[PDB]
Design a protein around this ligand. Sequence first.
Ligand SMILES: Nc1ccn([C@@H]2O[C@H](COP(=O)(O)OP(=O)(O)OP(=O)(O)O)[C@@H](O)[C@H]2O)c(=O)n1
Ligand SMILES: Nc1ccn([C@@H]2O[C@H](COP(=O)(O)OP(=O)(O)OP(=O)(O)O)[C@@H](O)[C@H]2O)c(=O)n1
Ligand code: NA
Ligand code: NA
Lengths: 215, 219
Amino acid sequence: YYRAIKKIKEAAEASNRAYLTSSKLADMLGISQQSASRIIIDLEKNGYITRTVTKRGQILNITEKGLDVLYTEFADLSRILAIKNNVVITGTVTSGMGEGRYYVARKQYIIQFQEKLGIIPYLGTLNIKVDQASLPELRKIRGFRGIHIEGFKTEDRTFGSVKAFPAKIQNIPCFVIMPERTVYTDVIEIISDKYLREEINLHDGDRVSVEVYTE
Amino acid sequence: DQYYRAIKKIKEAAEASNRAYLTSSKLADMLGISQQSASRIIIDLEKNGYITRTVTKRGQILNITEKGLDVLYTEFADLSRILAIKNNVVITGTVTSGMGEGRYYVARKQYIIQFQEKLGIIPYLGTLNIKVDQASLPELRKIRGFRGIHIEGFKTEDRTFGSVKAFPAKIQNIPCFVIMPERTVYTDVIEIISDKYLREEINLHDGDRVSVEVYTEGH
DNA sequence: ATTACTAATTCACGAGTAA
DNA sequence: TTTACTCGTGAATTAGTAA
Ligand SMILES: Nc1ccn([C@@H]2O[C@H](COP(=O)(O)OP(=O)(O)OP(=O)(O)O)[C@@H](O)[C@H]2O)c(=O)n1
Ligand SMILES: Nc1ccn([C@@H]2O[C@H](COP(=O)(O)OP(=O)(O)OP(=O)(O)O)[C@@H](O)[C@H]2O)c(=O)n1
Ligand code: NA
Ligand code: NA
């Protein structure tokens, strides 16, 4: 489905919507009209686009899952060709229930954070709600593999594999952690051996910049 | 796209070396296909110039060619363009002298008119040759995947002159352009044009190492 | 115009196997 | 073990249409 999503995004230009016909997509791809029509139907069925289709053609909306196909390909090639592509994300500090402390305190995560990232972290995650204008940079980071943290099973629940990226928030070293199975939210989570709210005097609502190292 | 996927996987296995020791069934496992299909893909990649091989009863040594890498860098450049990810380039290399033929090519009226309209310059008649350092060859390949500024080719009673792509560039803070044929030629020599005579503008001697910044978007 | 169904066709895939 | 051939099968694609 990669080539068709690539061409729909190219047609969508700046935005993530394109007004197209199956014939236009077909000739963009070097395939028959009938195949392009089928490809559009399958992309919608599998959640890569949403669409409105009439006898006047189609409005195709690339979803976050559709875009992730392209950003994942870009990250694959960046990694395989050793092309540097670090990222800056800006967002705002938020608070929650204490979910991050529950996760980070798991013994099976802690051992891996030390073995793979070299830290014993503060038990928690600093949540950052990414600004709308930084969403393309969030999509780019989510494309990359980062440092693999193996998931595990306990008696109460199952914990998925996560990926870690070396990062800096106001020049404080830290790591962005996200599930390897991507879920499209605007919230990123940061761990560090420093308690970041104290280290850099953060409050809910403060805007911060996070540099993320994808290599 | 199946060739793209196979080239990508072979490069993934090869990493920086551009060489991967593989059996066809090992590549098949990597691609999720049959041993036979992978052996057929390997032969077709060879037939089409994407790899060269040493083949024995033990396995294969698969060498990705410049053309094979161009497939991957062209796909990278496509995504960089479509996703609007800024991916300019810094090249290092050494100044060389040639046979003095760049002067002839740049002086073709049909190019000159396009250099003036599209690049805003009447070039000095010649090209500054830079032999790119071995360490900068991956970045040279990155540049070649991008489209640059299209310069249309043309026909005379003599010969055909091929289309050219130009990239805005800077050499030691001097604005210039890198120009290369659109029908990609896998050479380690890049060619710079400018309205300035660069030998005098920045006292360039043969063998001098220089850094060239090449803009693959905008500019 | 279109979309997109069904049927024809083709050509890609992998089984079997020789060397 | 390999590489890599032939060839039967069917999944993928296109053509012919209907709406
Ligand atoms: N390296 C870290 C990790 C966490 N925190 C902060 O420490 C607290 C505890 O983290 P957590 O348990 O994750 O709390 P919340 O983020 O509020 O909860 P949630 O994950 O539910 O959003 C939070 O105030 C969080 O911002 C921090 O300052 N530095
Ligand atoms: N903007 C430019 C263009 C070219 N040159 C120099 O102008 C001379 C003539 O260029 P050219 O005819 O292209 O000669 P070579 O580069 O030596 O020959 P060739 O292109 O065949 O390799 C060369 O010394 C070249 O380095 C320069 O300094 N400034
Ligand atoms: Na948290
Ligand atoms: Na020259």
